[PDB]
Symmetry: D2
Subunit: 165 residues, 4 copies
């Protein structure tokens, strides 16, 4: 085989881990690296860290910086792992950038941290890798085993899911 | 009417390494329950996926009659998006057989599985299930093998039994 | 085989699990039950739920109620899973009760939730079950692969461990 | 002087089910690295435990010379608290052999392992390691089998190979 994939990590629930110092969860090392370590991949992949912030902390300036970072990739297939709180805001922002118009850009993450039992993360990473390879140029959210149009999607905080508007 | 989430994907299971589990009686691994069901249980799916168990035979007892039954089951499915979980040692033989059924011509059929049992630590299984579900939804009609985070053409693929990987057969 | 063991669950980090509604960890179902399900035990065990409170929330009245509950057990071998924040306070309280003087009472738990990767919980449960069977009547803390005297122990919050005073 | 945490327990590993792991080459389980090390890595121990790997032989290739080497290693240890991880099919034979060595008379020696490999989901291994570490520290000198959350007298124990459990031999 497939086209080279570049993966950017912006934090989120997917990456949370337990720390004794905080007596709870903190954004830790990118879980996507753990998943891809055992995926026995054939194709070229590179993983780059952007952020470990809470996605609620992202400003417009942070989304502009994420846009420029995705634009630094020569790869035309991109996965961004991200928190679900503001995944829609980032995805809509990227979808408006003429500079990304040739790329397939998929945002994903997890509702349950990858390091907690019963997580969606590994499935979501496989699904989102396929989506980043196979979908036409555009910006997408891949969650819940489907592909969402960011312009027509919202995060339901109370129900812990993405849904059509 | 209130929105109904479609369920475009059906899954069939034929066993293989992906489903192996330890049994005290055998003092070893046997083909267990379908591991794909465990992965989808926690995937928080928007739709549902019907998972239909076809066979758990050991690779050695898996016959041509068994492959026929798989082709009947895939062709009879209403869904046009199909994932078959299967052993890797004869996945190419099953994929090639399904590619020859004209009844499958409008369906996207993806075969997948795992090199390491899902119930053993460090398994490729969950990644492979996520990737193969997407592939079965997104690829054009045809028969494919989805492994190692890529798509293989069954007519141009072999299994390297030593290394536990699929490899392309290069054109000459 | 061994003498019957009664296990009481009072919550704590050991039992924490991720909930979408809280966007974080909450005290969930007792992890000791998950561990003992696969331990293939020969002996008689019964598990009883007392509390799912944060151990910091326990009052003197709650510790008196825990004492009376342990006293309702005919078993002379007792494990109490508990949060580490006030495990010493509960253990010292129980150690002062003449009514428990014939029982072996062991408190344990985990520094990392059992449902998070890399947890101490399963090891701690095996160790603490053995301790509850094998130690002389008394009240003990079993953590870090050793047995602590509650009267001579403190929880180091900053270092996430129990240590001699 | 500032307090030094003693390390009263030494661990020896002789393989067994507890250590089995999946290998692509064998298309199956082999005796892998010592799983006891994985469990103790995350136990947040106050002391340290030296873990000494003695053997990984398949039960079939495990010989009387191999049992002798285990008795030499346990007797030469400075520690008087010893846990040996081992296969369950011949744990009673090894335990009985060690019980006959006068050099072991002041040591508490516990044998343990797992019915299900540590690297397979749903394994007894971590519980068994915690329980057997405590047992090796708390029991009086002697040789014991610690499994199923209890202590077995090797002279009065058999393995039920069908059920994957140790059972007492009742006195008559
Ligand atoms: Cl938290
Ligand atoms: Cl095997």
């Amino acid at each position: 085989s497939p086209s080279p994939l570049r993966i950017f990590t912006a934090g989120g629930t997917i990456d949370q881990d337990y720390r004794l110092e905080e007596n709870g969860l903190v954004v830790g090392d990118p879980f996507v690296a753990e998943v891809l370590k055992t995926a026995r991949l054939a194709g070229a992949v590179s993983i780059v860290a952007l952020s470990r912030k809470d996605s609620l902390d992202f400003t417009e300036a942070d989304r502009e910086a994420i846009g420029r970072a995705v634009g630094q990739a020569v790869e035309d297939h991109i996965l961004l792992t991200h928190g679900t709180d503001t995944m829609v805001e980032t995805a809509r922002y990227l979808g408006g950038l003429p500079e990304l118009a040739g790329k397939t850009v998929v945002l994903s993450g997890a509702m349950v941290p990858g390091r907690v039992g019963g997580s969606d993360a590994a499935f979501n990473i496989g699904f989102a890798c396929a989506a980043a390879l196979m979908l036409a140029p555009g910006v997408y959210i891949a969650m819940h085993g489907k592909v969402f149009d960011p312009a027509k999607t919202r995060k339901n905080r109370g129900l812990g899911r993405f849904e059509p508007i």
